[PDB]
UniProtKB/Swiss-Prot annotation, chain A:
Transmembrane segments annotated in the record for this chain: none
Occurrences of domain PCI (ranges): 1-157
InterPro entries referenced in this protein's UniProt entry, alphabetically: COP9_CSN8, CSN8_PSD8_EIF3K, PCI_dom
One GO cellular component term: cytosol
Name of the gene encoding the protein in the UniProt record: COPS8
Protein name: COP9 signalosome complex subunit 8
Chief subcellular location: cytoplasm
Superkingdom to which the source organism belongs: Eukaryota
GO biological process: activation of NF-kappaB-inducing kinase activity; COP9 signalosome assembly; negative regulation of cell population proliferation; protein deneddylation; protein neddylation; protein phosphorylation; regulation of protein neddylation
Lineage: Eukaryota, Metazoa, Chordata, Craniata, Vertebrata
Any Pfam family matching the protein: CSN8_PSD8_EIF3K
Record keywords: Cytoplasm, Nucleus, Phosphoprotein, Signalosome
Subcellular locations according to the entry: Cytoplasm; Nucleus
From Swiss-Prot, chain B:
Family: Belongs to the CSN3 family.
Organism: Homo sapiens (Human)
A GO CC term assigned to this protein in UniProt: perinuclear region of cytoplasm
Major location (coarse): cytoplasm
Protein name stated in the entry: COP9 signalosome complex subunit 3
GO terms of biological process kind: in utero embryonic development; protein deneddylation; protein neddylation; regulation of DNA damage response, signal transduction by p53 class mediator; regulation of protein neddylation; response to light stimulus; signal transduction; ubiquitin-dependent protein catabolic process
PCI domain boundaries: 195-363
Role description: Component of the COP9 signalosome complex (CSN), a complex involved in various cellular and developmental processes. The CSN complex is an essential regulator of the ubiquitin (Ubl) conjugation pathway by mediating the deneddylation of the cullin subunits of SCF-type E3 ligase complexes, leading to decrease the Ubl ligase activity of SCF-type complexes such as SCF, CSA or DDB2. The complex is also involved in phosphorylation of p53/TP53, c-jun/JUN, IkappaBalpha/NFKBIA, ITPK1 and IRF8/ICSBP, possibly via its association with CK2 and PKD kinases.
């Protein structure tokens, strides 16, 4: 919803630039928005597009690019660490929480689909949370098996108009 | 006398609007009377630019005949004039000379220092200058070049997704090169967005252009076609037999390293591919291909893993690492997890025994989703048939043949 509107706004800002060189906060917001939609190619090309002076102007761009570099390697614990290691400006704050929620949902879906039996430590690393918290949560949800062996088992439990158009076209 | 000549004459052509004389002067200027620099437009044209700014577009041409124009913001002002005071339907007056004007303006300074400045200008110009959304024009190549050189890939997407049919004549100013560039540079765009199918299609279209003369664009398109076919599929796709015979006589012998790379890829030995890449590294670096052959080397492992799934049903991680030569069970598990996430493979991992199972039952063809897919295919086919019938019925008007037969 709001993410698409922000994407349209920033695309409009970039498309027509009377000054030509946009503000570093604008480019940082664009990089963060590209990172949120897990579209790595566009984010990388936008990062390359940036003139070096605006890169060196602020360290927020460097932090966002570090986040992007970590997420490009598919290192989920690194993503979780780097999403909270540093601080950033106000305009990007309401998007990093959404990014963390999206990456948590993605990790949960990947664990559910790509694994039948997973070590609890691996699950905790994937979600970036203490083992006991995750265990309790997934006990309440119900997609988990048992303790001791340390093996949580993630399971996943106008036709008339179209037809008349087809036959009308076919009859010639 | 030239100044008041322009004044009253331009009054006639625009206000009185006789198409005969406006085209008369336009063609009289052309490329012959437009020489000898501007028509004293340094001082006389200073008054004339503010006159009407609609008959002066051809004039801008001569005002870009002089290289390294001292002021560049004047072109910005006049392009914002044509975009802002755009009536929408009288743009058909500037149909032939407009493409040349944009090519001249972008080919001089825009491609050198600021390749991002004219990204939106050409996009605005295309819709209001060319007739129908299915019409390939020369300014497409210029805009694709601008997008490629500025590392901007998103704005040019709607201009490449639509299949482009019919080419505007441009009064003979549309050289073949402008065609070959459009299907080449745009191809690079589709290799930057990880859309290998459309990139391969664009490269195939660029290769099959009938032309009995060697061009570097054709060579590069052939090389990138080979690389993309090796990445997407396990073999080089066979080019259609209607292509020009020059490709099989001069293009192939010069592009020899890519053919042996394809042979090594097809022999299915991931160890030898790295050695072959190392041996011919200088050729790939010279042709600016460091970033495509490495993708092929990486995708060889995925191809081997998929071929493993074609035979096995439940395999140990160590066994998979030994067969695919991934040198490690953890690395094999990571590769399988990445491929499962990407959707290229259907598998599950059981970490109790370090095993990987294959459940290849994705679709059963019993859901409305496949009905929707068949509906979309039907709609596309019907639209294609209607377009073909319309073109065929348009063709039959010409009296060229069918006299006694």
């Amino acid at each position: 919803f709001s993410f698409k509107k922000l994407l349209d706004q920033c695309e409009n800002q970039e498309l027509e630039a009377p000054g030509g060189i946009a503000t570093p906060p604008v480019y940082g917001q664009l990089l963060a928005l590209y990172l949120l939609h897990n579209d790595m190619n566009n984010a990388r090309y936008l990062w390359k597009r940036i003139p070096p002076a605006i890169k060196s102007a602020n360290s927020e761009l460097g932090g966002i690019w570090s986040v992007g570099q970590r997420i490009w390697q598919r290192d989920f614990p690194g993503i979780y660490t780097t999403i909270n290691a540093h601080q950033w400006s106000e305009t990007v704050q309401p998007i990093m929480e959404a990014l963390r929620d999206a990456t948590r949902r993605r990790a949960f879906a990947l664990v559910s689909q790509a694994y039948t039996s997973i070590i609890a430590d691996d699950f905790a690393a994937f979600v970036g949370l203490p083992v006991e918290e995750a265990v309790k949560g997934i006990l309440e949800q119900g997609w988990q098996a048992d303790s001791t062996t340390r093996m949580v088992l993630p399971r996943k439990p106008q036709q008339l108009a179209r037809l008349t158009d087809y036959v009308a076209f076919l009859e010639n | 006398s030239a100044l008041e000549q322009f004044v009253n004459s331009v009054r006639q052509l625009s206000a009185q609007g006789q198409m005969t004389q406006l085209c008369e002067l336009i063609n009289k200027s052309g490329e012959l009377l437009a020489k000898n620099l501007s028509h004293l437009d340094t001082v006389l044209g200073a008054l004339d630019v503010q006159e009407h700014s609609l008959g002066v577009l051809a004039v801008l041409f001569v005002k870009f005949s002089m290289p390294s124009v001292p002021d560049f913001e004047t072109l910005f002002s006049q392009v914002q004039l044509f975009i802002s005071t755009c009536n929408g339907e009288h743009i058909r007056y500037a149909t032939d000379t407009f493409a040349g004007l944009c090519h001249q303006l972008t080919n001089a300074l825009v491609e050198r220092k600021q390749p991002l400045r004219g990204i939106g200008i050409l996009k605005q110009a295309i819709d209001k200058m060319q007739m129908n959304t299915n019409q390939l024009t020369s300014i497409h190549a210029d805009l694709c070049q601008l997008c490629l050189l500025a590392k901007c890939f998103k704005p040019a997407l709607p201009y490449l997704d639509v299949d482009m049919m019919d080419i505007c004549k441009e009064n003979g100013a549309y050289d073949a090169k402008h065609f070959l560039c459009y299907y080449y540079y745009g191809g690079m765009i589709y290799t930057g967005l990880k859309n290998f199918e459309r990139a391969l299609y664009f490269y195939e279209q660029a290769i099959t252009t009938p032309a009995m003369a060697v061009s570097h664009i054709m060579l590069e398109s052939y090389k990138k076609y080979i690389l993309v076919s090796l990445i997407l599929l396990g073999k080089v796709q066979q080019l259609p037999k209607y292509t020009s015979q020059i490709v099989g006589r001069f293009i192939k012998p010069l592009s020899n390293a890519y053919h042996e790379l394809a042979q090594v890829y097809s022999t299915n030995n991931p160890s030898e591919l790295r050695n072959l890449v190392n041996k011919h590294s200088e050729t790939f670096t010279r042709d600016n291909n460091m970033g495509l052959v490495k993708q092929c080397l990486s995708s060889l492992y995925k191809k081997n893993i998929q071929r493993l799934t074609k035979t096995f049903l439940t395999l140990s991680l160590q066994d998979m690492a030994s067969r695919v030569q991934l040198s490690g069970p953890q690395e094999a598990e990571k590769y399988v997890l990445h491929m499962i996430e990407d959707g290229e493979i259907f598998a599950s991992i059981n970490q109790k025994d370090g095993m990987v199972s294959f459940h290849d039952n994705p679709e059963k063809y019993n859901n409305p989703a496949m009905l929707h897919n068949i509906d979309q295919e039907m709609l596309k086919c019907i639209e294609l048939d209607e377009r073909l019938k319309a073109m065929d019925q348009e063709i039959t008007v010409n009296p060229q043949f069918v006299q006694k037969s």
